[PDB]
Amino acid sequence: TKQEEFYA
Amino acid sequence: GAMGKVTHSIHIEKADTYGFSLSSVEEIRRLYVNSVKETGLASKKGLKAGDEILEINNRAADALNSSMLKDFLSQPSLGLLVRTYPE
Numbered sequence A: 001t002k003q004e005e006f007y008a
Numbered sequence B: 001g002a003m004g005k006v007t008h009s010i011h012i013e014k015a016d017t018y019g020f021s022l023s024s025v026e027e028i029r030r031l032y033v034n035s036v037k038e039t040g041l042a043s044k045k046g047l048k049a050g051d052e053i054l055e056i057n058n059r060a061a062d063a064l065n066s067s068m069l070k071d072f073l074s075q076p077s078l079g080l081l082v083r084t085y086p087e
């Protein structure tokens, strides 16, 4: 289950 | 290689990005590196896709808010401790 993706 | 845990301490510094994406997941919340931009700042530091982020700026992964997390990734300097797998 993927909650969020951050592109840092 | 075998099943022992190896970890990797990384310090990155910078308009610029660090050049990696990171997924937040549960199953036990965890932070995994999805990808690393070839030629980007995280890549020159030896960050690899599939590394799991264990600590950011001396704070445990579990104990990180979306809020501390947003704030940490936006700052000009970033300390990570990651679990890294043999290749």
Ligand SMILES: *S(=O)(=O)c1cccc2c(N(C)C)cccc12
Pocket: A001, A002, B023, B025, B026, B027, B032
């Ligand atoms: S979820 O069940 O779809 C789930 C659980 C754990 C990890 C996941 C990942 N990671 C990037 C490995 C992607 C998509 C779903 C997912």
Ligand SMILES: [Cl-]
Pocket: B002, B003
């Ligand atoms: Cl194995």
Ligand SMILES: [Cl-]
Pocket: B035, B036, B037, B038
């Ligand atoms: Cl990539």
Ligand code: NA
Pocket: B002, B003
């Ligand atoms: Na294994």
